Each structure stands twice: as structure tokens, then as C-alpha cells.
Subunit: 219 residues, 2 copies
Amino acid sequence: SNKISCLPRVAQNLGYHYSPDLPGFCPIPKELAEHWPVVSNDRYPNCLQITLQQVCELSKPCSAGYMVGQSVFVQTPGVTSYWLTEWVDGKARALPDSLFSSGRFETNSRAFLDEAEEKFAAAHPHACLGEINKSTVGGSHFIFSQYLPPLLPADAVALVGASLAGKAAAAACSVVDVYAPSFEPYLHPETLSRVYKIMIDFKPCRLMVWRNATFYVQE
Amino acid sequence: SNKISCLPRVAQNLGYHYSPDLPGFCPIPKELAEHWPVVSNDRYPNCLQITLQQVCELSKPCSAGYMVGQSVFVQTPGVTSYWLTEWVDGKARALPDSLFSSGRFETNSRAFLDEAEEKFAAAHPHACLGEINKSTVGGSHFIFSQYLPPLLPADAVALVGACSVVDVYAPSFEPYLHPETLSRVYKIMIDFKPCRLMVWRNATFYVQE
């Protein structure tokens, strides 16, 4: 294929599990795609339309991990990967704001995307780098963090155990493959502690922020 | 004969709603209390037994707000108020550990229970950061707090099922407020209603449920 798509969870979370054209979703006859909610490159009355360029006033640009046929690709920070356009009865409806997964989980890359993320990580070390306090592990919240297992699931925000063999362990710590700097807007609140409603791949989440100290995420 | 009861919500979050003897709950005929889960001072094959002294090794001592008949009394800290024994199919089972309400709300008290709580409040003047209800994070204070109105009608809400005011002996939170890591989420109970408690390491926290 030379057919673009989001990481499937992005569309699924919006409520779209079928596709006549895209391989990452459940297939369906095209006859039925007219009368049923679907992801596609093509347009249908009730539809999430994934395109390489803007369609409409209300098409959302997403700098995000994406896939072309079977091949998954990592996001390029600052660069749109695809435009989503939600159709209901052939009328475009606006999509909510949301952070996006970089495609690092499914491509198995633990690497920083660009240098700005590496600098961001070292600047907010408690939240990103991971550290060991007594017998517990704290702050291993990004795919690039330290005490994480060999394999990680591709979720918006994965719950996994973290560990330093012998010394420490932490069960069910939340881990995310988002381009870390995308959090920067939330890191300076009026109050010292602050709690934001956010979305990662359109999955409602809770961003917990302690100013100049740490942040983490839940579902 | 010593109609010693918990604050009704304690038994109710534990699943018991009827009682042949205790006025805090729904009436049920004594004859039928053999064949239905109940709260009582007496023993039935399925019941929550509230007594003044221990009954058996699985009876849970509870320092908490309590009642004698209709009258409601406040927690004396460091002293057991009632013992709870949960009978099921005639055999006692263990009860989960939980925090407990002091009974100040239903007493119209705003007072500290002792000097230990006063000193805690001074030492942590803004420990309670709010209550998490889904995404929205609404306001929440200890019943003694300076920032609460003098009137707290039951159109605010204490910490139990049927602006959020927590009527609990503040120093019982002290095990949670000192985590090793910078953040930590704890699973606790308050009056046996399950809650999460989401703490920062600066001894501040949000409540959930």
C-alpha cells in the first residue's frame, strides 16, 4: 500500500474500528461503509478521514506516529503526519485537542526523537529520566526512561512494572511515548500543584503537575 | 442495653442496611435477622456485630466517631470506640483496614480532637488540595479548616456514599503523606468506602470518592 493511516488506537478511541481501505482496522464491504462509521482515506457520510493534506476548515493536523500500509513510522517533531477530518451525515465536525503517540512503542525505538527532547528530558529529570528512591523506582514515565522492561505495549499510556535488579521495583507505573516537550504548556501553573484534563491519542487522561518538580499521567 | 453503633455509613459501605436493635439503621423484625445480613450488638449468622469490647481475635478495633442509641459522640483519639466483628455463615471473617470519620460533622463541631491534630494543621496548613471527581478537581478541606464556612449543611458532602469536607483525625493520614518517591497514589478506605489518595512528597494530596 501507499495508503496513510494513524496508529489504529487514535481512530478506535474516537469510535471507529472498521475500514474498507486501511489494513490496521477490521475490514468491511464498501457498500456498508456508506451506512456505518469507518476510518478511510476516502470520504463517507459517517467517517474519520485520514489524508496527507488538509481537506476542510475543521481538519485536525496531527504531528504523530503514523503508518503507510503495514509499515509504522515515528513522528517528526513539529511536522504534520496526517490530517484527520470527522464526517457525520456528510458534515465535518470539529475534533478535540489531544497529544499523540510518536510510534516509538510499536517500532520499539527507545531513542530521543530530536535533540530538544534530550535537553527537555535532562531539564525535567524527575519526570523523564527515572530515578531510584530507596526500594522504589520513580519517574520512569517515557519510553526513553531508565528502569523499564524489554517490551512495552503500544497504548496511549502503558502501565508496566519498572525495576533495577536487586535494589528496587515499581509496579504499574504509567509510561508514554509522546514527544516529551509537548507537555511544556502544562508545566507552569498559577497554583503549585495542578491537575489538567488532557487526551493522548484521544483517550481521556489526567495530567498531574507539581511545578518545577514532576508530572505524570492517568486514564 | 448499650446500643453502641458506628456512624451508620460505616456499616452501609460495608453492605449492611437493616438492624433489629440499632436505631441508626432500617428496622427489621428480630425473627428475620437470623436470615438476612444485619448490623447489631447481638450475633446472627450473617451480620456486622458492634460491641464495646472485643468478641474474638478477628474483631476490628475502631477509633472513630460513634453512637450510643440516638446520641452521637466524637472520636477520642488513641481509644477504641467500638469493636467490629463480621460474621458470615456463622464464622467471623477479617475486616479491611480503613480510616474513620470523627463524628464532628453530625455534632456541629469544628474543633481539633487534641493538640496533636492542632499541631498537624499548623505544620501542614494546606495539605488537602482538593477532591478528584472524574477529570474535574473540586474543593476540599478538613472540618477544622479556617477556609470553610461556619455553616456546613448537608449541601456540602462528607467522605461517604448514600465543598467536600473530610471529617477525619488528620494525623491518621501521616503514613501516606511521607512517600519515598516524589508522587504516589495510595488505595485506602474512609469509613470502608474505597478511595484513592494521590500524594505529592511535600505532604499534600488529593482525595478520590
